[PDB]
């Protein structure tokens, strides 16, 4: 029977494509038009340590996005870019992050949070959120930038414990280390997934 | 001070534990299989299936031997039953050790190098290595039969294993040394890989470390006396060695290792216990 | 037919809801300022649980919901058109597209000039 | 203008209320209830690398097609389980796939805003590009005409030979998620993300009636076998039946134990059974006339994304996010 | 939207009893050849 032969050939090709599919990591790039997403459907393919990353930027539809977002359920990570320089739209970015974080179909996806345009924020600070006055910088490395980071981290840690994680980063328009950061957080995400599997979580 | 009860209780406990582990593993394998390759789940499934089958077959043969009033003469004219029982014993002893070492290696790779583990291992390799481990255990079990010698009846007159209570040629000592060396190598590989994984995690982390420590302790404690006794017997000619009093105790400890494998591997997780 | 009617323009903005089970959804208050876009003011869950406010009105505005009366109240004490918006689906703690240029489950709004 | 629209809506509601003298449940009270339906899984089609997003039965009742997240379009033989075709897609964000009634063509589309049409005689034969939103559904009229719906709140009728929009259908205020063709192929129904459904005349190109009974977005729409009614599934965990002649909702299929949306609906050959796939990984079979859950289809490890009933009514195919297609009888 | 509402309101409607009766008639007539 030639039908069985054709099916076997198709299955062999499907196994090859299974190897190719599993050997690739896919990322969803999100952020407002204010932020510098491009500088960080458009498809960007890059390689870190002989590892392939495919990042998708969906900008061909309307602002109603509660239906086509479900297409990215099994994405490896969501790279969320935020303009920390503009305080006017900072609350919009916070609401966007909260909606992305608490979505039912994105509740198992980790977010790499980029706080872009840190040079503009530094310039603006040197010569909206009333809680900033009653704020003290943490015992972290080297106030406004860490205040914004903590504003995002409060939403991140409010819900979704152990299922997905947020990885904040401070970024400039001329930063060349974003790919390495993405690689490292993706490695941590894979480690967390393995740990959750080993414990039957 | 020997009775068929020991065998009966060991059979029942092992079978029940492994069946519970099998059901839990099937459900978890479906759930985690629609997310990635569940290599650890596949290896654990193989381990529990092997443990269940070994428990069933060896306990059935032991109960049949006990019920025959130890009359080993007038039921095996050609000693075919003794050879089959020895093959089953060797396979059911070797397979859990090699399997545990394999899962230790796989988890060490998946923890220390998660990107490589996810992108350059695949599930065909996992299935191939599981089948290869099982086939290697089968081949080592069959090797004395594939040669010239045959499995003898042990001093307790209730199980068949290598020729130990006799000053035989170099073949018996070689077989005992091979079994002991394989078991000790599996124990050492498992210890090293689990220690590396725990050190990496220390420097879901706490539960992983706890289960790694439990696996190491249980495996070492329950499998070291038997391997040490077998190596001592093989190196010497039983002139300076132990007797059936301690060999039976070591065999019981190994049986308890095979019993406790599903608990320290699958059944003691917080999600499973809920 | 899902209907949301806003009334009011210190103020006591009200929103009467019909065409859906009010005590199953998370409600929001949004505004559109002149020459600007739609901005999220406040948010209340389906059972009087955790309430969120925007920074510009934090501590100054309040939100409430009467499930039995199926009404949404906003007590205020800038000039904009205020809308009461509904989460797209019930039993979900996230309103996704409430501040969209064309949202189906948002009211007609009421003008407020200060 | 708002006052006039409100007055017209009130007049329409009053006319509907006056028209409704009896209820469907009251009429179907003396008929024998359908017994406990226990459909078993006869086939399980494996080979998709990720979630299955859509499927469509062929008119020959034997071959079907399915679209997957990994950008694959696989045509299966339901009887022998053998795979007939495997088509790679340029874009891996497909949302819908269709089978031609002749069986010579297969369509698909998704986030690329394109309807790709492949000739099975397998390479692409046509690429329809006029939509400004994601392509949610597509149904063949014949080898030359196709009806599509997209997330830009419009539907379209395309002449495949020329690749141009013969007709456009406007009026939905939300993204259109599903469409269903009438058996006569002269009318069709569409459900969108505004809790409303619309009946469109293909030839004229104008909206005939609008049905507003649901509370949330409508994800699935199916047409009654005789073409005088249709069923819709939505995100408010309910299914509804609407009659074209009465221009109103007839029955509601829901229970106070389902808190998940409906992703797919379908009708049996006689129309007595309504099959609906849910996000809770299971499918429910309802008695259409009595609005009673006649049975449950369980066995999918993830939410049921697509559901279809064969042209001769001899099988039900369900595809889920668990990367499997199951045939039930 | 007003013109569409007028067009939708300018049509005739059949009583719900007749629609239910026809649905029952079709289902009962075609239930003989329904494999499910
Ligand atoms: C090197 C082999 C290690 C055994 C591991 C195994 C097979 O997985 C567990 C096995 C028990 C089996 C022991 C066979 C005979 C025992 C002697 C009779 C005696 O003790 O007097 C039955 O006894 C019931 C099983 O639990």
Q: CB-CB: which of B24, B32, B122 is closest to A197?
A: B32
> 1.10.357.10, 3.90.180.10, 3.90.230.10, 3.40.50.300: which CATH number matches A22-198?
3.40.50.300
CB-side neighbour CA atoms (13 Å) of D167: 15
Query: Ligand 1 site: residues with CB under 6 angstroms?
Result: B 2, 6-7, 10-11, 14, 54-55, 58-59, 62, 89, 92-93, 156, 158-159, 248, 254-255, 258
> Residue written as tokens 């977002």?
A69
Task: Give nearest CA residue, ligand 1 atom 24.
Answer: B59
Q: Resolution, in Å, please?
A: 2.7
Which CATH number covers residue C42? 2.60.40.10
Q: Which helix (H) or strand (E) holds B33?
A: helix B4-33
CB contacts of A10 in chain D (<8 Å) are 47, 74, 83, 85-86
Count of C-beta atoms within a 10 Å radius of residue A94? 20
Q: Does the distance separating the beta carbons of D86 and A13 come in below 8 Å?
A: yes
Classify the C-alpha dihedral B20-B39-D68-A12 as positive or negative: negative
Residues with Cβ within 8 Å of D27's Cβ and at least 6 positions away in sequence, in order, are E17, E20, E21, E24
Name the pairing type of β-strands A110-116 and A77-83.
Answer: parallel
Name the pairing type of β-strands D316-320 and D304-309.
Answer: antiparallel
What order do you get walking across the sheet with C110-112 strand by strand?
C51-53, C38-44, C27-32, C80-86, C110-112
Q: Does the distance separating the beta carbons of A7 and D82 come in below 8 Å?
A: yes
User: Residue A50: what are its φ and ψ, rounded to 5°?
Assistant: 60, 35
Chain D contact probe: residue of A1, A58, A60 with most D CBs at under 10 A: A60
User: Residue A69: what are its φ and ψ, rounded to 5°?
Assistant: -70, -30
Please tell me the experimental approach by which this structure was elucidated: cryo-EM
Tokens matching residue D137: 């559904």
In CATH terms, is domain D1-328 a member of 1.10.1740.10? no
Domain ranges within chain A, ordered by starting residue: 22-198
Count how many pairs of residues, chain A against chain D, have C-beta atoms within 8 Å: 75
Residue in E with minimal Cα distance to D206: E4
Query: Which CATH number does E1-36 carry?
Result: 4.10.260.10
Q: What is the DSSP letter of C17?
A: E
* Coil, strand or helix at B173: helix
- Give the start-end residues of each E strand in A64-149: 77-83, 110-116
Q: Which CATH architecture has domain B4-260?
A: Up-down Bundle (1.20)
What is the rounded CA–CA span in Å between residue C42 and residue C51?
8
Q: Is D216 on the interface with C (CB under 8 A)?
A: yes
What is the rounded CA–CA span in Å between residue A189 and residue A1?
47
Rounded to the nearest angstrom, the minimum Cα separation between A85 and chain B is 34
Tokens matching residue A86: 């503009």
What is the rounded CA–CA span in Å between residue D294 and residue B183?
58
Chain B contact probe: residue of A191, A196, A201 with most B CBs at under 10 A: A191
CA angle B226, B229, B234 (to 5 degrees): 125
- What total of structural domains would you count in chain C? 1
Helix axes B170-202, B122-146, angle to 10 degrees: 160
> What's the gap between Cα B164 and its chain centre?
20
> What's the gap between Cα A141 and its chain centre?
22
Buried-state track D169-204, b at ≥16 Cβ within 10 A, e below 16: bebbebbbbbbbbbeebebbbbbbbbbbbbbbebee
Domain ranges within chain D, ordered by starting residue: 1-328
Q: Is C83 left (phi over 0), alpha (psi -120 to 50) or beta?
A: beta
Q: Kindly write down the DSSP assignment for every residue of B95-140, as one continuous string.
A: HHHHHHHHHHHHHHHHHHSHHHHHHS-HHHHHHHHHHHHHHHHHHH
Burial of A180 (C-beta count, 10 Å sphere; 0-12/13-18/19+): exposed
CB contacts of A14 in chain B (<8 Å) are none
Count of C-beta atoms within a 10 Å radius of residue C51? 13
Ligand 1 nearest atom to the CA of residue B251, by list position: 3
């Amino acid at each position: 029977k030639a039908a069985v032969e054709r099916s076997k050939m198709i299955e062999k090709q499907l196994q090859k494509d299974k190897q190719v599919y599993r050997a690739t990591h896919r990322l969803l790039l999100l952020g407002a038009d204010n932020s510098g997403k491009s500088t960080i459907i458009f498809e960007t393919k890059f390689q870190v340590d002989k590892v392939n990353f495919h990042m998708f930027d969906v900008g061909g539809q309307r602002d109603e996005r509660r239906k086509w977002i479900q297409c990215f359920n099994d994405v490896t990570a969501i790279i969320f870019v935020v303009d920390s320089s503009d305080y006017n739209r900072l609350q919009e970015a916070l609401n966007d992050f909260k909606s992305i974080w608490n979505n039912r179909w994105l509740r198992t996806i980790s977010v790499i949070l980029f706080l872009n345009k840190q040079d503009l924020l530094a310039e603006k600070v040197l010569a909206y959120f009333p809680e900033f006055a009653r704020y003290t910088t943490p015992e972290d490395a080297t106030r406004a930038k860490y205040f914004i980071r903590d504003e995002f981290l409060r939403i991140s840690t409010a819900s979704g414990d152990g299922r997905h994680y947020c990885y904040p980063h401070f970024t400039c328009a001329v930063d060349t280390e974003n790919a390495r950061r993405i690689f490292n957080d993706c490695k941590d995400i894979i480690l967390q997934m393995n740990l959750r599997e080993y414990n039957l979580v | 001070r020997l009775s068929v009860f020991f065998s009966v209780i060991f059979m029942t406990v092992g079978i029940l534990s492994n069946s519970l582990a099998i059901a839990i593993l099937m459900k978890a394998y479906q759930r985690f299989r629609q997310k990635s390759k569940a290599s650890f789940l596949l290896l654990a499934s193989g381990l529990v299936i092997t443990d269940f089958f070994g428990h069933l077959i060896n306990g059935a043969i032991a109960v049949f031997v006990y019920a025959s009033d130890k009359e080993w003469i007038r039921f095996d004219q050609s000693n075919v039953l003794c050879s089959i029982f020895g093959i089953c014993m060797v396979f059911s002893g070797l397979c859990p050790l090699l399997l545990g070492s394999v899962m230790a290696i796989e988890r060490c790779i998946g923890v220390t190098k998660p990107i490589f583990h996810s992108t350059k291992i695949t599930s065909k390799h996992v299935k191939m290595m599981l089948s290869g481990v099982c086939l290697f255990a089968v081949f080592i079990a069959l090797l004395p039969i594939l040669g010239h010698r045959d499995y003898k009846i042990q001093a307790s007159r209730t199980w068949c294993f290598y020729n130990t209570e006799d000053i035989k040629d170099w073949e018996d000592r070689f077989y005992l040394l091979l079994f002991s060396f394989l078991g000790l190598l599996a124990l050492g590989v498992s210890l090293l890989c689990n220690a590396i994984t725990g050190i990496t995690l220390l420097r879901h982390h706490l539960e992983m470390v706890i289960q790694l420590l439990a696996i190491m302790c249980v495996s070492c404690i329950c499998w070291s006396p038997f391997l040490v006794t077998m190596a001592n017997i093989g190196i010497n000619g039983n002139h300076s060695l132990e007797t059936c009093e301690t060999t039976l105790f070591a065999l019981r400890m190994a049986t308890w290792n095979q019993i406790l494998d599903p608990w320290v591997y699958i059944l003691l997780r917080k999600a499973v216990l809920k | 037919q899902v209907q949301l009617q806003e009334s009011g323009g210190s103020l006591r903005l009200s929103c009467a809801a019909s065409g859906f089970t009010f005590s199953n959804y998370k409600m929001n208050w949004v505004r559109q300022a002149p020459g600007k876009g739609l901005e999220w003011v406040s948010d209340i869950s389906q059972s009087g649980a955790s309430i969120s406010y925007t920074g510009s009105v934090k501590g100054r505005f309040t939100i409430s919901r009467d499930n039995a009366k199926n009404t949404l109240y906003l007590q205020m004490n800038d000039t904009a058109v205020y809308y009461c918006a509904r989460c797209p689906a019930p039993f979900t703690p996230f309103c996704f597209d409430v501040t969209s240029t064309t949202y189906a489950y948002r009211g007609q709004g009421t003008q407020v000039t200060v | 203008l708002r006052q006039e629209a409100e007055q017209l809506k009130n007049q329409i509601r009053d006319a509907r209320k006056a028209c409704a003298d009896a209820t469907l449940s009251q009429i179907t009270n003396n008929i024998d209830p359908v017994g406990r339906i226990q459909m078993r899984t006869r086939r399980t089609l494996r080979g998709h690398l990720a979630k299955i997003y859509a499927m469509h039965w062929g008119t020959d009742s034997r071959l079907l097609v399915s679209a997957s997240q990994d950008g694959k379009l696989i045509i299966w033989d339901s009887y022998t389980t053998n795979k007939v075709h495997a088509i790679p897609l340029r874009s891996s964000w497909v949302m819908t796939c269709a089978y031609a009634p002749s069986g010579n063509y297969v369509a698909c589309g998704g986030l690329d805003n394109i309807c790709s049409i492949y000739n099975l005689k397998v390479r692409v034969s046509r690429e329809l590009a006029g939509h400004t939103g994601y392509l949610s559904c597509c149904r063949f009229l014949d080898d030359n005409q196709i009806v599509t719906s997209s997330g830009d709140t419009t539907c379209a009728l395309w002449d495949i030979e020329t690749g141009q929009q013969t007709t456009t259908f406007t009026g939905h205020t939300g993204d259109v998620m599903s469409l269903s063709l009438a058996p006569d192929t002269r009318l069709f129904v569409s459900g969108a993300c505004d809790a409303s459904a619309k009946l469109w005349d293909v030839r004229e190109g104008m909206c005939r009636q609008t049905f507003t009974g649901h509370e949330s977005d409508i994800n699935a729409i199916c047409f009654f076998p005789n073409g005088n009614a249709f069923a819709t599934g939505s995100d408010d965990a309910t299914c509804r039946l609407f009659d074209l002649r009465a221009d109103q909702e007839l029955m509601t299929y829901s229970h106070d134990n389902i808190i998940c949306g409906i992703t797919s609906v379908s009708f049996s050959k006689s129309g007595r059974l309504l099959l609906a796939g849910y996000d809770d990984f299971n499918c429910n079979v309802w008695d259409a006339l009595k609005a009673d859950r006649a049975g449950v289809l369980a066995g999918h490890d993830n939410r049921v994304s697509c559901l279809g009933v064969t042209d001769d009514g001899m099988a039900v195919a369900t595809g889920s996010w668990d990367s499997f297609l199951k045939i039930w009888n | 939207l007003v013109e569409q509402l007028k067009m939708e309101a300018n049509i005739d409607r059949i009583k719900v009893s007749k629609a239910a009766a026809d649905l029952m008639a079709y289902c009962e007539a075609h239930a003989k050849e329904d494999p499910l």
